[PDB]
Design a protein around this ligand. Structure first.
Ligand SMILES: *[C@@H]1O[C@H](CO)[C@@H](O)[C@H](O)[C@H]1NC(C)=O
Ligand SMILES: *[C@@H]1O[C@H](CO)[C@@H](O)[C@H](O)[C@H]1NC(C)=O
Ligand SMILES: *[C@@H]1O[C@H](CO)[C@@H](O)[C@H](O)[C@H]1NC(C)=O
Ligand SMILES: *[C@@H]1O[C@H](CO)[C@@H](O)[C@H](O)[C@H]1NC(C)=O
Ligand code: NI
Ligand code: NI
Ligand SMILES: [Zn+2]
Length: 348
């Protein structure tokens, strides 16, 4: 029977740059999936996937998380989840960027930075106490998480379909969350610009002119993660770079997360100001499944499958027979479908 499940990952790649063709070939080897990875220009690191047949598809993409801070090691800002149902034609070309996680501050392979991570270096803390702010020993806030982009080409112009925002960069010192909401855009005339970049870099938007090195670049520019603070270097070896997919570079403050509209970062290197999560987007073409919650940690991914309405099942996981079109609630992970037709149970 034909294949209905397709899972796109970072192909084992991490950082501000995307995966290679060899990385994705090795990742999808022996799996029922093959893509062509871009190697030059703004498509470098983006996976091109050929639609096998004209049908209805569920495109659910998850953004990447930001990087941990240095002092508190408080848990990351997770990525945004977006799920959409689209009508696609055979041989259509989907362009899929899988956002990569922003660089964690700790641990570090640099010996002096590691002394700051384990806490046996009080230079940053005594600089905040005495000098009242960080301008000398800056850095330590993780870079912004790269966003996940799934877009199309129509008459020679990129058309976005699903953009899952990237998580904001956790600042160096952070014992607070404030649980910001996750924005989502549907009307396309709203400009998908970058996030505001201060000392730390802002997130990369959909299409903008990124002029700052530490800022994450937009999707149509390559979506490369930004560098760290110029002051974070030349004093430390501190590199907290934004993830691939518009992730903003890191400073003592957190870098902004990429998305349709880049996440805004701190403007004056605030050691406690995290980076804002990016702005997600879904095309007017297509139906929204579940509002844009933030769930997954680590790298992002994209799950595309032949759309089936499995809402009657207890868990929304069901498959359809290709010939007889008999839909059955999919269970098997060690379980067997119960007598009520839904709600899988453990058999043996
Ligand atoms: C604050 O004062 C001066 C300003 O540059 C600087 O030399 C000093 O090292 C700073 N304080 C600390 C604790 O670093
Ligand atoms: C667009 O998204 C916003 C934020 O999720 C929502 O409030 C608004 O109703 C949406 N508009 C349409 C037409 O779906
Ligand atoms: C999108 O928003 C702009 C203003 O924000 C408005 O002028 C335009 O008509 C909107 N597009 C649609 C399709 O509603
Ligand atoms: C899925 O099927 C249910 C009935 O089981 C229906 O109420 C719902 O509107 C359907 N959803 C979609 C997106 O077709
Ligand atoms: Ni958030
Ligand atoms: Ni590094
Ligand atoms: Zn179908």
């Amino acid at each position: 029977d034909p294949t209905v499940h397709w899972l796109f990952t970072t192909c084992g790649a991490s950082g501000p740059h995307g995966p290679t063709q060899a990385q994705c070939n090795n990742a999808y080897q022996n799996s029922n999936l093959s893509v062509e990875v871009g190697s030059e220009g703004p498509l470098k690191g983006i996976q091109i996937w050929k639609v096998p047949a004209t049908d209805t598809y569920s495109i659910s993409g998850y953004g990447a998380a930001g990087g941990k801070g240095g002092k508190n090691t408080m848990m990351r800002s997770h990525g945004v989840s977006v799920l959409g149902i689209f009508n696609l034609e055979k041989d259509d070309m989907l362009y899929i960027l899988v956002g990569q996680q922003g660089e964690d501050a700790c641990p570090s392979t640099n010996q002096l930075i590691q002394k700051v991570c384990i806490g046996e270096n009080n230079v940053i803390e005594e600089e905040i106490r005495v000098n009242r702010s960080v301008h000398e020993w800056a850095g330590g806030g993780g870079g912004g998480g790269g966003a996940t982009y799934v877009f199309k080409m129509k008459d020679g112009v990129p058309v976005p379909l699903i953009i899952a925002a990237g998580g904001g960069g956790r600042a160096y010192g952070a014992k607070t969350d404030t649980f910001h909401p996750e924005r989502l855009e549907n009307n396309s005339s709203v400009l998908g610009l970058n996030g505001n970049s201060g000392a730390a870099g802002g997130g990369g938007g959909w299409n903008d002119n990124t002029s700052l090195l530490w800022a994450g670049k937009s999707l149509q520019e390559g979506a490369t993660g930004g560098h760290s603070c110029p002051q974070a270097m030349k004093k430390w070896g501190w590199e907290t770079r934004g993830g691939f997919g518009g992730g903003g570079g890191g400073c003592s403050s957190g870098g902004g997360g990429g998305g349709y509209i880049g996440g805004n970062a701190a403007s004056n290197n605030d050691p406690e100001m995290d980076g804002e999560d990016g702005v997600s987007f879904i095309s007017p073409l297509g139906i929204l499944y579940t509002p844009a919650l933030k769930v997954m940690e680590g790298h992002g991914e994209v799950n595309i499958k032949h759309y089936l309405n499995c809402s009657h099942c207890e868990v929304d996981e069901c498959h359809m027979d290709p010939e007889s079109h008999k839909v059955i609630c999919f269970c098997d992970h060690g379980t067997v479908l119960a007598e009520d037709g839904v709600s899988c149970i453990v058999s043996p």
